[PDB]
Design a protein around this ligand. Structure first.
Ligand SMILES: CCCCCCCCCCC[C@@H](O)CC(=O)N[C@H]1[C@@H](OP(=O)(O)O)O[C@H](CO)[C@@H](O)[C@@H]1OC(=O)C[C@H](O)CCCCCCCCCCC
Ligand SMILES: [Ca+2]
Ligand SMILES: [Mn+2]
Ligand SMILES: [Mn+2]
Ligand SMILES: [Mn+2]
Ligand SMILES: [Mn+2]
Length: 243
């Protein structure tokens, strides 16, 4: 089919087997026919390095690679949960790693894609955390630690994140509308697709002196979510995990 697909915020983990089964079934569906599949971050609930022997990682890598081998190029933009996904997993899965912002030409429509966390520019605490965990020497230090140490550090970060999210106001954590305009005018696009916020919606705004739209993907909780771009339209689609 002449369509390009976008998903994000699956937060896969061995403790949520139903979501994993829904993703595996999705990879065997119309996704096998798409022009391309873009995964905009937070594919996994957490990532502590490509050397993690977590069997779910190889199961997911195998299923994506079968999609790639079937002729569907697959791309990945990092999320706040899996920014440590590296070239070893890209090779294992056949995915191509992209930068934090990418501008696509989709059947004549220019579209900006990103995970979306960098649009929450009022959360100065988060952005300070993000700058640190993206520093290469700090990443290399974390990756040199034993796996059982990395698990403990990840567990503490998750605990403190859930605490800070409960003590922070939604008005300081949500997407900043001026950061959206700035990003869409930096790339001169009228269309933007992102995830992270788990609030699937289509927001109309103004950018480049024209109407513009910000499409938000949904997290995979009870059902799946995807954006489908065709030469004719942009579709936000919700579907069950199983038939
Ligand atoms: C090189 C290091 C590698 C570490 C890899 C470990 C594996 C990855 C672990 C994932 C942690 C991630 O969840 C943190 C995060 O992203 N929080 C922001 C996010 O909230 P979520 O709970 O993730 O949905 O989205 C929310 C909305 O945007 C936002 O609010 C949250 O941001 C925060 O809550 C962060 C706080 O503001 C500041 C917390 C920093 C203090 C924690 C430091 C712990 C260091 C312990 C060292 C032993
Ligand atoms: Ca706000
Ligand atoms: Mn998410
Ligand atoms: Mn094809
Ligand atoms: Mn996120
Ligand atoms: Mn259709």
């Amino acid at each position: 089919m002449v369509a390009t697909l976008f998903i994000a915020d699956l937060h896969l983990q061995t403790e949520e087997p139903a979501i994993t089964a829904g993703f595996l079934r999705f990879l065997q569906g119309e996704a096998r026919q798409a022009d391309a599949l873009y995964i905009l971050g937070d594919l996994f609930e957490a990532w502590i390095g490509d050397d993690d022997p977590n069997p779910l990682h190889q199961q997911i890598a195998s299923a994506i690679k079968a999609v790639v081998d079937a002729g569907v190029p697959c791309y990945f933009i990092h999320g706040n949960r899996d920014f440590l996904v590296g070239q070893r997993f890209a090779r294992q899965s056949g995915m191509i790693l992209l930068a934090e912002e990418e501008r696509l030409d989709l059947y004549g429509r220019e579209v900006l894609i990103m995970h979306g966390d960098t649009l929450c520019t009022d959360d100065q605490g988060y952005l300070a955390f993000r700058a640190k965990v993206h520093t290469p020497w700090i990443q290399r230090l974390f990756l040199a630690l034993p796996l059982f140490i990395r698990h403990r550090i990840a567990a503490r970060m998750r605990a403190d994140s859930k605490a800070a999210n409960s003590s922070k106001s939604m008005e300081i954590m949500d997407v900043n509308p001026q950061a959206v305009v700035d990003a869409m005018e930096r790339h001169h696009v009228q269309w933007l697709i992102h995830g992270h916020t788990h609030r699937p919606a289509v927001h109309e705004l103004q950018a480049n002196g024209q109407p513009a739209w910000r499409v938000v993907l949904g997290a995979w909780h009870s059902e799946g979510s995807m954006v489908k771009v065709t030469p004719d339209d942009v579709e936000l689609i919700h579907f069950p995990f199983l038939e």
